[PDB]
Design a protein around this ligand. Structure first.
Ligand code: ZN
Ligand code: ZN
Ligand code: ZN
Ligand code: ZN
Ligand code: ZN
Ligand code: ZN
Lengths: 130, 89, 130, 89
């Protein structure tokens, strides 16, 4: 192709490097405070708006309280260490490992079923209206 | 509880202080036309007056920084070479 | 006296500049976040060990819970924005403005009587043993 | 309540990752002698084996970095010119 869009791809790889560096930095800083039982395991990344297009309209829905607290912690940590990295709240990206419980089998949720299953945990026997 | 979350792989998007309420070049907004377009129609004749996003996560009107490229060549809020990584909000 | 000695004083002034810059930066970041900020006017000064000698043995006591939370939030902000360092707690430095309440007269405590007066607020009729 | 705190003027002191448990030059401790002194007495004959503090808030044994000044001249954990702003813990 040439150095027209391959430069954009190289920038995307640089963004990936930035994301993993920020992830390990945030893990190191989480090792320090440890306030609430919401940051047990966190593989959170940091991306730039230009490289990765917005999914649809940046979804803004009820998030689970433990993950909600974890995301608050992440946002604060970022806006302090790399002042200027205001983490926006979205849901159409990422994944998670849900530990279910005869053995303890861990499920997987792609940041879509976390809210519904959290509502089920809070109170079962729900429907579409709930 | 019956289901507990152990791991999370959230992805955080960040944007700089683009001042969505005041364009850093024209001081109108991050949308709703610019100083040299003003009125919505203003004899639009196709073309475009959308938002331009750079490699530095800065956002201005396409017209504003398209004209500003003739005055300088480094994004005013920083000292980085301005790219055109995105077009529109 | 020679610039050899005034160089340390110039470094101390540079440290003062750094402290006030970090203070205004932390205030700006608290305007966006600042969850744990019990002390309304958290005027926190950041100094370096070398310039300013330790007072006696770096004291510790029953700091008031609201100033405790304010100091914890300030230290977390300072350990994030300025990473690579650790924040220590001390009491033989600084001052405070205690709002008392016929009018509302504001007192002043030089970081010495804050713990005793906080204990009095929690429960009056104390003594040396308490 | 009867007394409430409005303002606070705490002063925060900071120190870099000096590794109080391992000297960054000799790997013994931030106190308790050094590699070339070892035993507490070791024919002390006055002199001193205390801690040296630099302008960069780094701490090592005075002997360790006094000898290290002949090998290099920039504090190993950074690239700053090493000063002698304090002596002892
Ligand atoms: Zn504009
Ligand atoms: Zn226009
Ligand atoms: Zn820019
Ligand atoms: Zn040593
Ligand atoms: Zn020695
Ligand atoms: Zn150093």
């Amino acid at each position: 192709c040439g150095c027209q869009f391959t430069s954009k791809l190289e920038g995307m790889f640089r963004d990936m490097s930035i994301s993993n560096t920020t992830m390990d930095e945030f893990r190191q800083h989480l090792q320090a405070t440890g306030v609430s039982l919401g940051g047990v395991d966190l593989t959170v990344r940091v991306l730039t708006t230009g490289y990765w297009p917005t999914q649809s309209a940046t979804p803004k829905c009820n998030i689970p309280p433990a993950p909600r607290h974890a995301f608050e912690i992440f946002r604060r940590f970022y806006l302090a260490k790399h002042s200027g990295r205001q983490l926006t709240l979205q849901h159409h990206m990422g994944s998670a490992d849900l530990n279910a419980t005869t053995r303890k089998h861990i499920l997987q949720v792609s940041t879509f079923q976390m809210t519904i299953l959290m509502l089920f945990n809070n109170r079962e026997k729900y429907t579409f209206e709930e | 509880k019956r289901f507990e979350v152990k791991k999370w792989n959230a992805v955080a998007l960040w944007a700089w202080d683009i001042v969505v309420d005041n364009c850093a070049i024209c001081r109108n907004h991050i949308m709703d036309l610019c100083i040299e377009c003003q009125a919505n129609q203003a004899s639009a004749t196709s073309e475009e007056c959308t938002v331009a996003w750079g490699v530095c996560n800065h956002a201005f009107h396409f017209h504003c920084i398209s004209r500003w490229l003739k005055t300088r060549q480094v994004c005013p809020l920083d000292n980085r070479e301005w790219e055109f990584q995105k077009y529109g909000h």
